[PDB]
Amino acid sequence: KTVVVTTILESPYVMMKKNHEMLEGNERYEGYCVDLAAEIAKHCGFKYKLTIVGDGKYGARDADTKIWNGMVGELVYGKADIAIAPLTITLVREEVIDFSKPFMSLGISIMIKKGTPIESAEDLSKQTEIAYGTLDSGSTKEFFRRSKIAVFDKMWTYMRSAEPSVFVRTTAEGVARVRKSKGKYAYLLESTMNEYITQRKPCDTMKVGGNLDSKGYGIATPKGSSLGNAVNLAVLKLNEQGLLDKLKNKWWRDKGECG
Ligand SMILES: N[C@@H](CCC(=O)O)C(=O)O
């Protein structure tokens, strides 16, 4: 049986190939997670179909309906068999789906337009001229919502209250806002995405400050699925064999364009 893989368009994990409208099936896509999916499938002995998550989201539980959206929802409601994506391992997700051990480490970070007078989350929290926000329906937003650390709680209070919204639907939208705002908007995003984007033209953004936390992305399967065990062992093997580092350097180091 062909395994349905849910994933998300998020550079450099999964990207549409150039001129993709002429292409079909898995051949439409490239990136770190496209390469990782082929390795996991080989190691686990399955054929698979990559499917971009219908709503474009990572996955959160709606506070009002208690329904999961995003890739998490596609696993919970049976629409996909596995998620191979930069999906953060979190407590609320682990309650409803399973995760492999991490395939990549990360933490929350800050992107600014070059020259913006901000060095830290504390700097953001103590002023109002520069607006800032996060992605909807992901783990960064939930981090701020739940934090009891004074600086991050002050940031949450500001973000949830801002009108019009400072939250964006896609990472690309957040980055576009950093640029369009001439640096009057800063963006809170994971260090992995920040490190890729800041090294691609136009070379006008930068990462500032230390990471705010330390966590990992995992391969997710529906709770109790027969694939979970083999997928976890495959992640560990690929790490130990050096393959995850090679893919990281293919999609980050080797893609740099900013000198
Ligand atoms: N990796 C995050 C999405 C990106 C973010 O929230 O900054 C997640 O799994 O929700």
Side-chain angles (χ1 to χ4, degrees):
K1 176 168 183 131
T2 300
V3 168
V4 177
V5 179
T6 187
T7 193
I8 188 163
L9 290 174
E10 184 74 84
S11 300
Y13 296 96
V14 183
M15 299 178 287
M16 306 304 307
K17 290 182 185 171
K18 197 166 175 179
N19 199 34
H20 58 90
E21 292 176 2
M22 69 171 295
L23 304 176
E24 299 186 273
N26 292 350
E27 285 73 24
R28 290 169 289 182
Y29 307 112
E30 60 187 351
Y32 177 103
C33 282
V34 176
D35 292 347
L36 181 57
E39 289 281 2
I40 294 176
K42 186 64 172 282
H43 282 276
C44 294
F46 65 76
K47 299 172 167 168
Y48 64 98
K49 168 189 280 200
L50 299 176
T51 298
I52 306 303
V53 60
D55 66 9
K57 297 178 171 290
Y58 285 88
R61 194 177 86 170
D62 186 280
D64 295 286
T65 66
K66 304 191 71 168
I67 289 166
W68 287 95
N69 68 12
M71 291 178 283
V72 177
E74 297 192 343
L75 296 176
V76 165
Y77 306 107
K79 304 173 184 176
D81 303 307
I82 191 168
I84 304 178
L87 186 65
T88 307
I89 298 161
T90 67
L91 177 60
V92 291
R93 293 170 178 170
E94 194 86 269
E95 291 182 316
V96 298
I97 62 183
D98 289 335
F99 287 96
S100 72
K101 299 301 187 300
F103 66 85
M104 194 174 296
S105 300
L106 69 299
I108 297 165
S109 68
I110 298 164
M111 176 186 288
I112 56 167
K113 197 165 182 97
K114 286 181 179 180
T116 296
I118 291 293
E119 302 187 306
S120 68
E122 187 172 11
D123 284 350
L124 282 172
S125 78
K126 285 165 33 178
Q127 54 86 61
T128 59
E129 169 76 1
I130 301 157
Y132 50 92
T134 82
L135 186 67
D136 282 336
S137 307
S139 58
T140 300
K141 190 170 178 187
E142 181 75 3
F143 174 91
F144 283 99
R145 176 179 285 117
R146 298 304 170 188
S147 186
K148 297 180 172 183
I149 297 177
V151 163
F152 304 151
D153 189 51
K154 184 167 184 161
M155 290 172 71
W156 176 244
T157 298
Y158 155 80
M159 296 187 288
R160 65 171 170 79
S161 298
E163 291 291 350
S165 190
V166 291
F167 303 113
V168 299
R169 295 167 294 183
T170 66
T171 304
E173 283 179 79
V175 176
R177 196 164 165 178
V178 172
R179 295 178 162 135
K180 177 86 173 302
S181 71
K182 311 185 188 180
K184 302 292 183 177
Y185 180 83
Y187 188 56
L188 289 153
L189 78 172
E190 292 168 336
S191 56
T192 43
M193 304 183 196
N194 200 1
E195 286 168 18
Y196 178 77
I197 296 164
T198 56
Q199 303 310 308
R200 297 290 291 183
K201 288 182 44 193
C203 300
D204 63 348
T205 63
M206 64 179 286
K207 173 177 188 325
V208 298
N211 289 353
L212 309 186
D213 61 359
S214 295
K215 60 202 179 184
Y217 298 145
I219 307 300
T221 45
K223 208 147 171 271
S225 159
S226 76
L227 284 181
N229 179 58
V231 165
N232 183 59
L233 296 177
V235 169
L236 295 177
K237 184 173 277 190
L238 292 173
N239 194 22
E240 285 171 21
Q241 291 190 342
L243 185 277
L244 300 182
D245 290 308
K246 276 184 163 182
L247 291 183
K248 189 83 186 300
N249 282 332
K250 178 179 174 182
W251 293 102
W252 276 253
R253 182 191 71 192
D254 285 359
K255 295 284 282 175
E257 303 186 298
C258 292

